[PDB]
Amino acid sequence: SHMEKIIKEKISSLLEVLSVEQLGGMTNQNYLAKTTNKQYIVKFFGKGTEKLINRQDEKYNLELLKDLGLDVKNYLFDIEAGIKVNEYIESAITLDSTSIKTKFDKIAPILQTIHTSAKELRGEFAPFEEIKKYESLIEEQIPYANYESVRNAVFSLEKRLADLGVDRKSCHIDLVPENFIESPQGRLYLIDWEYSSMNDPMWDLAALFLESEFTSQEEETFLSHYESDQTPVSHEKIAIYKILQDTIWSLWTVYKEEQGEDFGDYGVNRYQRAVKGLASY
Amino acid sequence: SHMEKIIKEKISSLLVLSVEQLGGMTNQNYLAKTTNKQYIVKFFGKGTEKLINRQDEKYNLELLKDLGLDVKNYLFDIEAGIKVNEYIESAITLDSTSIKTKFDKIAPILQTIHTSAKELRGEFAPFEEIKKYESLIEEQIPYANYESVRNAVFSLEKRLADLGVDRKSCHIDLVPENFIESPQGRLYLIDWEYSSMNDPMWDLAALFLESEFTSQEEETFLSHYESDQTPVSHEKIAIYKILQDTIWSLWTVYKEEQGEDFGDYGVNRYQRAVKGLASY
């Protein structure tokens, strides 16, 4: 297999490869390389995700955040090749929408650490600008019902956020539960910092809550772990960022599906939840 | 009788049909009906010194004037234990029901005071305020299981410190009846006797608690109030509700030691702190 061979030549500089396995997620460009000694996570990136992710920026941000010890080790990051190679924590457990709700005392400290880090990431996340970005990148008509009316309801939140005050801190930006992994010592790592950018920390909170479908009670309990003098909490900003997230990810989905991918109902389901969020708000 | 006769011989230097005794959390307030104007006559003395620094109150009245939130004060005579205010004729005094229709008016008033940047005389340190009442109370505190409840309340000091405590000009006493609607349409916020430096969440907690806001009403009000300059912490609000019920329950014990009778006000406020501690 040619893909199998390419991986062997990309990682031999770090060494007896016994196995290469295709990994899921939301990018088919992920592989697991098993060696005699160690196991490696091999990530590819080429054409589609450029125009989305600045890889030079990502490389800087990886180097930047290393001392926080939140992410796993990165061995290789070569933009030329389009190759990323990370440490694979063997016998580590990936969190999901159920198990994440048992880990508040570990997740809250992780989020406090990044949000209060004073780290200056390359990249600013300006959600309305991001919406404009995806709109520009999408070639066909956006397939979602009532889009022009929804878009304009969403854009009315910009003034609201401005009135509420927008903070600018280092954020992960993509707190799906599978981005948390627990090692045997019970240490939680937060991985996959590809979208990471300066933003309001309430974005990260909204993402955590939304991706795992936190109940109102679970949100309040999590906020009691998280809220502090250095980490203030705005419930309204969270509600607004949930809508912006559903909007942005639904558009991301349309773009990705034009670039080859198929995510079933993922896009429409997120879009419709944005519409519901707008009606409740 | 003699009450009418002190009032005339005090408010005379401002110019008298009748005089009426007003209800509430005091029996020392009087309505003086005058030919041209209506007056609120407020008496204080020994029963409220050691609680209210009347010199600081007078300074604070002066400092807060440019906000234009309170009614006109004509006379503030400390030496004589007498305060005289404008009374707003044909005003609507808000209550726990009507206050909930006035969010678009109340929220900017609270924003105006909280962002005033004014340095009032008086710091409101709630745990120090609890220690103060305990010292002032001469008989035992009658509230059941007080030691254990007080220990629980004092555990909130560290939590508040972890959350961060802000220090701003606050009204400190947001009973609905302190909001007055003029027939002209404007709202007045009156009775600034307790006003001092505190976290603005104390004021929000007082507003919510004194008028028994529902969760939804609180949420709606917060949407009017929350801004970059006036951030909101729900947890801090829940904590200040407990501290308020505790402090006012103790204030009640102190006042009743002077012979005043608030019925079940004190114990009900105490139990609401107890119940707040259990829910928290």
Residue numbers in the entry:
A (entry chain A): -1 to 13, 18 to 283
B (entry chain B): -1 to 13, 19 to 283
Quoted passage from the original study:
Each asymmetric unit contains two molecules of LicA. The interface between the two molecules is about 650 Å2, which is not large enough to maintain a stable dimer. In fact, LicA exists as a monomer in solution, which was confirmed by gel-filtration chromatography. The overall structures of two molecules are very similar with a root-mean-square deviation (RMSD) of 0.4 Å over 280 Cα atoms, thus we took molecule A for further structural analyses. Three structures presented the snapshots of the conformational change in the active site upon substrate binding and products release. In the apo-form state, the enzyme adopts an open conformation (1), with the P-loop protruding outwards from a wider active-site pocket. Despite no metal observed in the three structures, we propose that the activity of LicA is dependent on Mg2+, as deprivation of metal ions using ethylenediaminetetraacetic acid (EDTA) drastically diminished its activity by 6 fold.
Afterwards, the choline kinase LicA phosphorylates choline in the cytoplasm to form phosphocholine, which is further activated into CDP-choline by the phosphocholine cytidylyl transferase LicC. Therefore, the choline kinase LicA is crucial due to its role in initiating phosphorylcholine metabolism pathway. Here we determined the crystal structures of apo-form LicA at 1.94 Å (apo-LicA) and two complex forms with choline (LicA-choline) and AMP/MES (LicA-AMP-MES) at 2.01 Å and 1.45 Å, respectively. The structure of LicA adopts a protein kinase-like fold which comprises of an N-terminal domain (residues 1–92) and a C-terminal domain (residues 93–283).
